[PDB]
Design an enzyme around this catalytic site. Structure first.
Site, PDB file in Angstrom:
ATOM      1  N   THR A 147      18.778 -16.776  -4.221  1.00 56.48           N
ATOM      2  CA  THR A 147      17.741 -17.689  -4.721  1.00 56.48           C
ATOM      3  C   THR A 147      17.870 -19.159  -4.250  1.00 56.48           C
ATOM      4  OG1 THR A 147      16.288 -18.488  -6.349  1.00 56.48           O
ATOM      5  CG2 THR A 147      18.611 -17.915  -7.087  1.00 56.48           C
ATOM      6  N   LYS A 181      -0.204   4.269  -1.300  1.00 52.01           N
ATOM      7  CA  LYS A 181      -0.993   5.638  -1.528  1.00 52.01           C
ATOM      8  C   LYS A 181      -0.689   6.791  -0.870  1.00 52.01           C
ATOM      9  CE  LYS A 181      -4.495   3.767   1.898  1.00 52.01           C
ATOM     10  NZ  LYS A 181      -5.682   3.432   2.152  1.00 52.01           N
ATOM     11  N   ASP A 220       2.743   3.518   7.504  1.00 52.20           N
ATOM     12  CA  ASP A 220       1.617   2.693   7.762  1.00 52.20           C
ATOM     13  C   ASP A 220       1.942   1.274   6.708  1.00 52.20           C
ATOM     14  OD1 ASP A 220      -1.998   2.798   7.575  1.00 52.20           O
ATOM     15  OD2 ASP A 220      -0.765   1.002   7.131  1.00 52.20           O
ATOM     16  N   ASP A 247       0.964  -1.315  -0.191  1.00 54.80           N
ATOM     17  CA  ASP A 247       0.094   0.141  -0.071  1.00 54.80           C
ATOM     18  C   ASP A 247       0.981   1.369  -0.063  1.00 54.80           C
ATOM     19  OD1 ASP A 247      -2.830   1.399   0.216  1.00 54.80           O
ATOM     20  OD2 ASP A 247      -2.032   1.632   2.314  1.00 54.80           O
ATOM     21  N   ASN A 267      -0.176   7.936   2.991  1.00 55.02           N
ATOM     22  CA  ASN A 267       0.819   7.146   3.642  1.00 55.02           C
ATOM     23  C   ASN A 267       2.183   7.625   3.671  1.00 55.02           C
ATOM     24  OD1 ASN A 267      -1.261   5.376   4.827  1.00 55.02           O
ATOM     25  ND2 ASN A 267      -0.879   3.928   3.045  1.00 55.02           N
TER      26      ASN A 267
HETATM   27  C1  LIG Z   1      -1.998   6.230  11.304  1.00 57.25           C
HETATM   28  C2  LIG Z   1      -0.910   7.112  11.924  1.00 57.25           C
HETATM   29  C3  LIG Z   1       0.101   6.148  12.693  1.00 57.25           C
HETATM   30  C4  LIG Z   1       1.327   6.874  12.980  1.00 57.25           C
HETATM   31  C5  LIG Z   1       1.507   8.113  12.683  1.00 57.25           C
HETATM   32  N1  LIG Z   1       2.610   9.051  13.163  1.00 57.25           N
HETATM   33  N2  LIG Z   1       2.393  10.241  12.675  1.00 57.25           N
HETATM   34  C6  LIG Z   1       1.135  10.363  11.869  1.00 57.25           C
HETATM   35  C7  LIG Z   1       0.563   8.870  11.914  1.00 57.25           C
HETATM   36  C8  LIG Z   1      -0.660   8.299  11.554  1.00 57.25           C
HETATM   37  C9  LIG Z   1      -2.112   5.400  10.251  1.00 57.25           C
HETATM   38  C10 LIG Z   1      -2.303   6.363   8.974  1.00 57.25           C
HETATM   39  N3  LIG Z   1      -2.439   7.135   8.121  1.00 57.25           N
HETATM   40  C11 LIG Z   1      -0.572   4.736   9.972  1.00 57.25           C
HETATM   41  N4  LIG Z   1      -0.449   3.648  10.364  1.00 57.25           N
HETATM   42  O1  LIG Z   1       0.138   5.352   9.397  1.00 57.25           O
END
Ligand SMILES: *[C@@H](c1ccc2[nH]ncc2c1)[C@@H](C#N)C(N)=O
Ligand code: NA
Length: 302
Positions: free
Chosen positions: A171, A131, A151, A129, A134
């Site tokens: 491998t 996107k 994330d 992921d 993140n």
């Molecule tokens: C929430 C998140 C976790 C930790 C963070 N530290 N600074 C901002 C954040 C936000 C989730 C989202 N988006 C994630 N696991 O990143």
């Protein structure tokens, strides 16, 4: 079967921290000892089991541009992952709101972000992921050094049938073909997500979505064999070389798609000094783009 050393201790999370508002569920916390603020991701062990995630953070969190793990707790029910708190907001969000932004800066940002992924790929790790929501700024300094990938909840380590940790280069141990197969896709999808990032940064809008109301069917119809648009309007002032990088990053066929290694060898990335330093003509609807992004990845994950 090797021991997994995790949680199950005396000191709880509540003892050393205090939970502030929201930001699995994310919340801003504070370390009551030093009064320093952090971010805490609370995971439900009856849902996720973030053993794969925490392993990656421990091992790769050292990377400057990867969100750094500052602590972890286990109460037996929930898992608490304490990381550094991003004070710079979403990277793409902030960028789109800059009237003055050029390719030279766009190439420097993508370079820092791609160089980071090249490392993760080489160790057999795929984010899966990527996107834009993140990718965040740790601070407002504006420097790519303040960029953080976050994330990893969907991230995955390459492993053999033995359960061993594997790297793409070595491998010599048996790994299920379909595992190496998916590993291929997942790595290609990461580059694809970065292709969507660059496209939006340059023009100011997303390639496969207009706004949050676009039906998944048409969004997926675009993402399918359907080709995107690299010319006219906001693309008139964009460098010809930059358009080349975008098309190869978003290439429909994963096997023909570019790899983080190759992306870094692209003239757009390699010769940045050749790139235009003047503000790009872009649509300004950052909030609309937000809706388009969420809608695009909603169609993918459904
Ligand atoms: C929430 C998140 C976790 C930790 C963070 N530290 N600074 C901002 C954040 C936000 C989730 C989202 N988006 C994630 N696991 O990143
Ligand atoms: Na880091």
């Amino acid at each position: 079967s090797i021991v997994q050393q995790l949680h199950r201790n005396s000191i709880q999370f509540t003892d050393g921290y205090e939970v502030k508002e929201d930001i699995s569920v994310c919340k801003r916390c504070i370390h009551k000892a030093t009064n320093m603020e952090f971010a805490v991701k609370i995971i439900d062990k009856s849902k996720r089991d973030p053993t794969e995630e925490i392993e990656i953070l421990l091992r790769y969190g050292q990377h400057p541009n990867i969100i750094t793990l500052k602590d972890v707790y286990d109460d037996g029910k929930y898992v608490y992952v304490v990381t550094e708190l991003m004070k710079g907001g979403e990277l793409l969000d902030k960028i789109l709101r800059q009237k003055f932004f050029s390719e030279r800066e766009a190439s420097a940002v993508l370079f820092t972000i791609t160089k980071t992924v090249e490392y993760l790929h080489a160790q057999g790790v795929v984010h899966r992921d990527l996107k834009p929501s993140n990718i965040l700024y740790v601070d407002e300094s504006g420097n790519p050094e303040s960029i953080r990938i976050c994330d990893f909840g969907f991230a995955k380590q390459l492993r053999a049938e033995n359960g061993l940790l594997m790297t793409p280069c070595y491998t010599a141990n048996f790994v299920a073909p379909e595992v190496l197969e998916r590993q291929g896709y997942d790595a290609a999808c990461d580059i694809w997500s970065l292709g969507v990032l660059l496209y939006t940064m340059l023009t100011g809008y997303t390639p496969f979505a207009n706004g949050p109301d676009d039906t998944p069917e048409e969004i997926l119809a675009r993402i399918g064999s359907g080709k995107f648009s690299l010319s006219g309007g906001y693309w008139n002032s964009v460098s010809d070389t930059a358009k080349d990088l975008v098309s190869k990053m978003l290439h429909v066929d994963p096997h023909q798609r570019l790899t983080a290694a190759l992306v870094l060898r692209h003239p757009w990335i390699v010769h940045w000094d050749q790139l235009p330093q003047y503000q790009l003509n872009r649509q300004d609807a950052p909030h609309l783009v937000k809706g388009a992004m969420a809608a695009t990845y909603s169609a993918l994950n459904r």
